[PDB]
Amino acid sequence: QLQARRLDGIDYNPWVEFVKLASEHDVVNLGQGFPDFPPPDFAVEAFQHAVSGDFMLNQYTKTFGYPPLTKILASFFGELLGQEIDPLRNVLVTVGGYGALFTAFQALVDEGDEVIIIEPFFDCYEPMTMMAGGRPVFVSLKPGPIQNGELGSSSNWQLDPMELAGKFTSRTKALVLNTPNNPLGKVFSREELELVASLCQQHDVVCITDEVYQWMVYDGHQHISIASLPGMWERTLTIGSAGKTFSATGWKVGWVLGPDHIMKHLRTVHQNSVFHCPTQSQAAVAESFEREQLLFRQPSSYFVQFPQAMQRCRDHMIRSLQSVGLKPIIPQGSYFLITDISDFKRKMPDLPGAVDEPYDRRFVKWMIKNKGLVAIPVSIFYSVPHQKHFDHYIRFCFVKDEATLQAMDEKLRKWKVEL
Amino acid sequence: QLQARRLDGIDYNPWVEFVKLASEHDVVNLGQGFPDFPPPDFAVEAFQHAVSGDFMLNQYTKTFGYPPLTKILASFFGELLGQEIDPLRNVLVTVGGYGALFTAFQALVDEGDEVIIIEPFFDCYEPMTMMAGGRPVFVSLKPGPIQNGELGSSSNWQLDPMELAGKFTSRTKALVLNTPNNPLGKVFSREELELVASLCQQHDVVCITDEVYQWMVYDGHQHISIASLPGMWERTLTIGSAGKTFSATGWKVGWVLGPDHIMKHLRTVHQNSVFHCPTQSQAAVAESFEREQLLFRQPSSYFVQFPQAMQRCRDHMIRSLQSVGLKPIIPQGSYFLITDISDFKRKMPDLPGAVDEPYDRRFVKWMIKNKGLVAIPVSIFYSVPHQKHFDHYIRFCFVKDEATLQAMDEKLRKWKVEL
Ligand code: NA
Ligand code: NA
Numbered sequence: 014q015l016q017a018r019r020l021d022g023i024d025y026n027p028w029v030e031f032v033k034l035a036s037e038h039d040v041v042n043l044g045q046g047f048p049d050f051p052p053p054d055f056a057v058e059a060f061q062h063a064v065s066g067d068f069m070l071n072q073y074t075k076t077f078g079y080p081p082l083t084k085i086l087a088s089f090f091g092e093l094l095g096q097e098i099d100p101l102r103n104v105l106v107t108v109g110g111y112g113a114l115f116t117a118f119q120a121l122v123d124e125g126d127e128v129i130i131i132e133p134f135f136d137c138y139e140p141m142t143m144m145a146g147g148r149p150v151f152v153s154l155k156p157g158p159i160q161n162g163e164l165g166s167s168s169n170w171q172l173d174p175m176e177l178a179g180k181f182t183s184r185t186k187a188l189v190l191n192t193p194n195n196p197l198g199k200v201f202s203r204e205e206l207e208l209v210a211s212l213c214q215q216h217d218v219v220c221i222t223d224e225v226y227q228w229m230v231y232d233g234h235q236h237i238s239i240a241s242l243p244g245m246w247e248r249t250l251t252i253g254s255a256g257k258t259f260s261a262t263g264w265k266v267g268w269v270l271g272p273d274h275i276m277k278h279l280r281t282v283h284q285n286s287v288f289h290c291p292t293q294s295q296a297a298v299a300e301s302f303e304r305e306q307l308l309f310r311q312p313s314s315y316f317v318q319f320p321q322a323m324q325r326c327r328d329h330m331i332r333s334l335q336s337v338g339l340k341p342i343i344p345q346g347s348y349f350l351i352t353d354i355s356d357f358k359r360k361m362p363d364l365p366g367a368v369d370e371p372y373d374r375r376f377v378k379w380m381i382k383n384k385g386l387v388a389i390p391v392s393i394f395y396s397v398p399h400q401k402h403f404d405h406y407i408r409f410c411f412v413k414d415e416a417t418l419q420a421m422d423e424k425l426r427k428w429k430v431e432l
Numbered sequence: 433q434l435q436a437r438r439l440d441g442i443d444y445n446p447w448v449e450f451v452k453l454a455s456e457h458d459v460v461n462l463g464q465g466f467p468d469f470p471p472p473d474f475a476v477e478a479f480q481h482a483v484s485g486d487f488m489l490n491q492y493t494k495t496f497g498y499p500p501l502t503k504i505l506a507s508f509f510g511e512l513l514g515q516e517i518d519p520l521r522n523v524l525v526t527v528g529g530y531g532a533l534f535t536a537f538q539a540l541v542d543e544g545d546e547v548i549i550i551e552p553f554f555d556c557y558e559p560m561t562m563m564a565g566g567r568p569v570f571v572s573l574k575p576g577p578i579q580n581g582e583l584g585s586s587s588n589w590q591l592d593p594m595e596l597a598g599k600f601t602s603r604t605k606a607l608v609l610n611t612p613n614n615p616l617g618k619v620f621s622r623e624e625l626e627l628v629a630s631l632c633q634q635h636d637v638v639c640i641t642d643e644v645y646q647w648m649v650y651d652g653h654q655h656i657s658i659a660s661l662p663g664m665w666e667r668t669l670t671i672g673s674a675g676k677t678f679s680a681t682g683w684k685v686g687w688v689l690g691p692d693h694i695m696k697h698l699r700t701v702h703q704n705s706v707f708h709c710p711t712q713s714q715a716a717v718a719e720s721f722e723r724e725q726l727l728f729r730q731p732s733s734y735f736v737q738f739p740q741a742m743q744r745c746r747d748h749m750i751r752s753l754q755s756v757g758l759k760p761i762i763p764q765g766s767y768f769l770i771t772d773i774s775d776f777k778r779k780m781p782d783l784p785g786a787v788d789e790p791y792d793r794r795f796v797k798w799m800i801k802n803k804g805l806v807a808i809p810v811s812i813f814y815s816v817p818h819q820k821h822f823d824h825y826i827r828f829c830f831v832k833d834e835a836t837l838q839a840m841d842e843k844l845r846k847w848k849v850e851l
Contacts, residue, residue, distance in 0.1 A: 015638075016697040017542040017564065024700045028495065051487040060712070064479045068470040071680045076448065108527055108706045115705045123436040140704045145436065219434075261490045263711030278435040281443045285559050286534040286705075287527045291713060292682030293479070 023140035027393050034378065035387045041420045043330075043409045044387035046195070046348055047262040050414040053315050055304050056259040060297035070292050076284055078106035078268070079295035085302045086268055094241045094251070094270075102273040105283060106290050109265040110225045110254035115141060116286075117187075117221050117250050117269060120278035122147040126186035131172065133196050133394035133403070135223065138189045151396045152180050154197070156342075164331070165342040165353070167199040168234075174208055181212050187219045188212075190239060193226040196351055196394050196408040198344020200234045210242045219275065220245065225254040225267075226347040228316045231324045234345040240270070247272050250279070255298040257348075260319070260412075266290065266298050323348075323411065329418055330411040337428045339407075348412045351391055355405045371404035380407075385424045442559035446812050453797065454806045460839045462749075462828045463806035465614070465767055466681040469833040472734050475678040478719035482712040489711050495703055497525035497687070498714035504721045505687055513660045513670070513689070521692040524702060525709050528684040529644045529673035534560060535705070536606075536640050536669050536688060539697035541566040545605035550591065552615050552813035552822070554642065557608050570815045571599050572822075573618065575761075583750070584761040584772075586618040587653075593627055600631055606638045607631075609658060612645040615770055615813050615827040617763020619653045629661045638694065639664065644673040644686075645766040647735045650743045653764040659689070666691050669698070674717040676767075679738070679831075683713045742767075742830065748837050749830040756847050758826075767831040770810055774824045790823040799826075804843045 035042055042049075051057065063070055077083070083100035091098040098104065107113040114137060122128060124146035130138045132153040142149045153176070157169025190209060192201040201209075213220050220239055227236045240249040250271040256262035269279055308314035327350065331341045340353040358372050366375035373390035380386050391406035411418075454461055461468075470476065482489055496502070502519035510517035517523065526532040533556060541547060543565035549557050551572040561568045572595075576588025609628060611620040620628075632639050639658055646655045659668040669690040675681035688698055727733035746769060750760045758771040773795055783794035792809035799805050810825035830837075 014542075015694065016539060016700075019542075020539065020697055020700045023704055024696070026495070026699075026703045032494075047491045049488070049491075052490050057483070057487070057490065060483045061480070064476070064483050068476075069468070071471050071476065071682050072466045072468075073675075073681045075451075076445070109708070111707045112705065120435055120439065123438070137704065137707070144704055256492075262492045263490050263708075265706070265708055265710040275434065277443070278439060280445075281435075281439045284445045285442055285556065285563055286531065287684070288530045288556070289528070289682070289684055291684040291710060294710060294713075 019144045019146070021143070023143055027136070031389060034381055038381055038385070040381055040385050040387050041417060041424055042387045043411070043413065043421065044389045046410050047256075048260045048412050048414075049417055052259055052261040053319075055315070056261055056297070056301045059300035059304075060264070060294065062300065063293040063296035066296075070296055072292065073289050074292040074295065076289055077101070077280055078104060078290070079292060079299060082106060082295045082299035082302075085299050085306065086270070089302055089306045090251075090253075090270055094238055094246075096240070096246055098270060099273070103270060103276055105269045105276060105279050106295060107267045107269060107283070108287060108290060109256060109267040110223065110252055111137065111267070112265075112287070113252040113254075113267040113269045114138070114221070114223065116279045116282045117252070118142060118145045118147070119282045119286075121219060121275070122186055125184065127182060127184040128186060129180050129188040129218075131190065131194075132396065132399060133194070133391060134189070135191055135195050136393050139396065147186065148184070149396070150180050150185070151399070152177050153399065154199070164340065167194070167197050167342055167344045168202070170197060170199055172201075172205055172208065177208065178212060181216045181218065185216055185218045187221050189221045189223065191223040193229060193236070193344075193346025195226065195347050196349050196389070196391055197342070198347040198349050198351070200230055200236065200345040203237055206237055206239045206242060210239060210245050213248060214244055218248070220249045221252070222249055223252045225252065225257040227253065228258060229320055229323065229348060230346040231320060231327060232345060236346070248275075250275060255294075255301070259298070259301050259315070264294050264298070266294050326411040326413060326418060330409060330421070333418075333422055333425055334409070336425050337432060342406075348410050349408050350411060351406045351408050352388075353405060354407055358405050369401075371400050373404050373407055377407055384428045386421065438563045438565070440562075442562055446555070450806075450808065453800055457800055457804060459800060459804050459806050460836060460843055461806045462830070462832070462840065463808045465829050466675075467679045467831050468836055469679075471678050471680040472738070474723045474734070475680055475716065475720045478723075479683075479713065479716035481719065482715035485715075489715060491711065492708050493711040493714065495707055496520065496699060497523060497709070498711060498718065501525060501714045501718040501721075504718050504725065505689070508721055508725050509670075509672075509689055513657055513665070515659065515665050517689060518692075522689060522695060524688045524695060524698050525714060526686045526688060526702070527706060527709060528675060529642065529671055529686040530556065531684075531706070532671040532673075532686045532688045533557070533640070533642065535698045535701045536671070537561060537564045537566075538701045538705075540638060540694075541605055544603060546601060546603045547605060548599050548607040548637075549815075550609065551815065551818060552613070552810060553608070554610055554614050555812050558815065566605065567603075568815070569599050569604070570818065571596050572818060573616070578759075580759075583759070586613070586616050586761055586763045587621070589616060589618055591624055591627065596627065597631060600635045600637065604635055604637045606640050608640045608642065610642040612648060612655070612763075612765025614645065614766050615768050615808070615810055616761070617766040617768050617770070619649055619655065619764035622656055625656055625658045625661060629658060629664050632667055633663055637667070639668045640671070641668055642671045644671065644676040646672065647677060648739055648742065648767060649765040650739060650746065651764060655765070667694075669694060674713075674720070678717070678720050678734070683717070685709065685713050685717050745830045745832060745837060749828060749840070752837075752841055752844055753828070755844050767829050768827050769830060770825045770827050771807075772824060773826055777824050790819045792823050792826055796826055803847045805840065
């Protein structure tokens with residue numbers, strides 16, 4: 014056998030199919046989880062400055078991060094977390110949030126360790142756990158009671174304390190928390206975070222917290238970082254993404270924040286994998302954060318203006334999608350919302366697909382080809398045994414240009430005529 | 433323990449210490465393996481174009497590579513290798529040559545596998561083998577016996593056919609070939625590559641070939657790619673680095689080329705680690721290769737001009753270092769040359785240092801503090817059992833500005849005439 018056993022069961026990449034199909038039809042692409050408009054001017058200018066400035070920025074920088082970037086991350090997130098952060102010992106710059114996650118799993122997860130993952134989960138958590146020899150253990154958010162004709166809210170998908178507690182064992186190494194959650198758009202409450210924190214402390218478990226959508230919060234909901242809770246800094250790794258912060262997903266710069274006794278192991282993985290991150294994008298991200306720190310909580314800041322603008326896009330999409338009978342679940346954060354397609358499953362059950370194929374995957378293919386709209390089937394964010402049960406949601410991304418939302422409405426109006 | 437056992441024995445990073453000591457003294461830094469002058473204008477301009485062009489270049493590109501980049505890599509290297517290369521199946525863009533190496537080890541090396549490593553080796557090959565559960569197996573190039581009438585050549589460092597053959601077993605998974613070699617600067621001959629090819633075919637072993645210094649060849653010596661030899665494409669992974677190609681080490685873009693039946697496993701690692709490489713640097717690299725393809729073999733091409741310029745730098749450094757009794761080994765390629773310090777070990781045997789600290793490490797510290805010149809001790813490129821024997825070489829980098837070479841000569845003047 015040529016390949017390593019660590020690759021068992023993790024070769025299938027659903028994203029390649031999704032991207033391929035969308036490219037082959039006339040569509041409004043609401044499946045792409047990135048903006049189709051420019052990043053803010055200050056961010057693009059920052060990168061332009063980095064590639065036209067000091068010529069030595071074309072050469073290697075320091076292994077654990079470009080010092081101006083680790084300095085501003087430590088200062089800014091130190092303030093946000095109520096934590097003294099040492100840029101040398103508590104910050105690691107990585108190749109995006111993906112690279113940060115990978116670094117954490119490869120540092121901490123070992124053969125036989127259990128890792129608690131919360132469904133619906135960003136799909137890589139499962140195969141990253143597996144490649145590190147871990148055993149994924151799933152806890153499932155419970156969709157709230159659908160009442161009195163109103164739309165569901167992500168806030169009401171519950172993390173049951175008894176279910177969660179039952180998942181912790183002596184083999185648990187880590188719990189992966191993603192808030193705001195992709196795909197659901199749930200913003201975890203202080204009470205929910207206190208529940209997770211209490212169990213992590215009880216069982217001596219590390220919390221890997223993926224906070225890439227930190228700034229994308231709506232309706233007055235506040236992002237709370239679990240590392241800011243009492244006793245949690247010493248057992249938490251906090252992950253962010255410049256791409257999701259500054260609407261520049263192609264920059265692929267991320268970071269991990271955490272205490273030295275954990276971070277030293279991530280540094281070991283880093284120096285034995287990529288060694289350096291690119292210099293100039295790090296300089297761009299540092300300049301961008303400096304801009305936002307100076308304007309923090311002011312009306313002209315991107316972190317104030319941008320979520321307000323995207324909240325309007327969310328509301329537009331929520332209203333529009335109902336015109337064809339899709340039932341949105343209102344998100345409190347992230348780039349995304351999901352819609353229940355149960356009415357379609359009930360009335361239109363017989364879509365072509367493979368024998369075991371979840372309805373949502375079949376429905377998305379039908380929607381792309383026939384209605385000209387792309388979404389992502391939510392079953393990809395579930396463990397395989399649960400996919401047959403959570404097969405009736407699809408994920409839309411509303412972080413789109415005005416023109417794209419208008420184009421969406423053109424497709425929806427056509428669909429409504431033939432309902 | 434908290435951390436995964438895959439990290440055992442790979443946490444010590446010599447480079448962090450090297451940077452530290454140099455930063456504390458007034459030095460000419462010939463330890464840094466990167467240019468201290470700008471990349472060529474066309475390369476810097478290409479990056480400027482990528483960050484000021486199509487705004488959608490700020491967002492994600494395709495998982496396995498920015499298509500214009502994979503297209504030109506497949507075209508350009510397909511012609512050099514005498515191989516039809518499909519961009520989608522045979523090319524993977526990675527986070528530098530480092531990331532490419534890491535991806536290869538994680539795809540192919542498993543618990544118990546052996547990996548043959550040729551000393552002196554780029555230092556990461558050993559811990560990357562270890563982190564993947566492999567057992568490193570070392571074969572040493574044997575230094576040419578030198579007559580002090582004329583300087584040794586890296587070409588005289590021999591790969592003994594019997595010694596190499598004896599390293600192969602049923603457990604050998606891969607052999608790592610680095611040519612041109614860092615730190616020695618050896619450019620492997622056709623005969624040497626035919627020896628490696630014969631054994632890899634006989635034993636059904638994969639050759640991981642690190643060709644980052646491909647363009648840095650001197651004195652009429654030709655880079656030969658082992659994947660071009662009969663029957664080798666089907667068992668070789670060929671690695672390159674944009675940083676080493678365009679003198680832009682901080683760009684951190686690299687690639688692997690190989691047959692689909694091996695590459696599919698590298699894609700599995702990639703999609704479960706970083707998922708995307710940054711978009712804009714990939715675009716810059718593609719444009720830079722387009723420029724060099726158009727000017728292939730022409731006087732104005734970087735691949736013609738740059739190695740000629742650096743050969744002059746090499747010759748300057750070879751002459752200069754002899755003034756103080758260092759004995760250079762003339763390299764045929766790479767950024768580097770090594771000097772034998774055996775005369776210093778003879779005359780000055782008792783340098784301060786830790787227990788069992790190899791002489792070369794002690795000598796470099798002495799030279800930094802007293803003479804203001806940085807080199808890298810070559811013992812870091814040897815397995816621990818062999819460091820006792822190979823303790824009398826240090827590595828210099830001659831890919832430096834003319835002002836830096838002038839500053840080197842000032843230090844050498846002081847060394848000779850002062851104190
Ligand atoms: Na425990
Ligand atoms: Na064999």
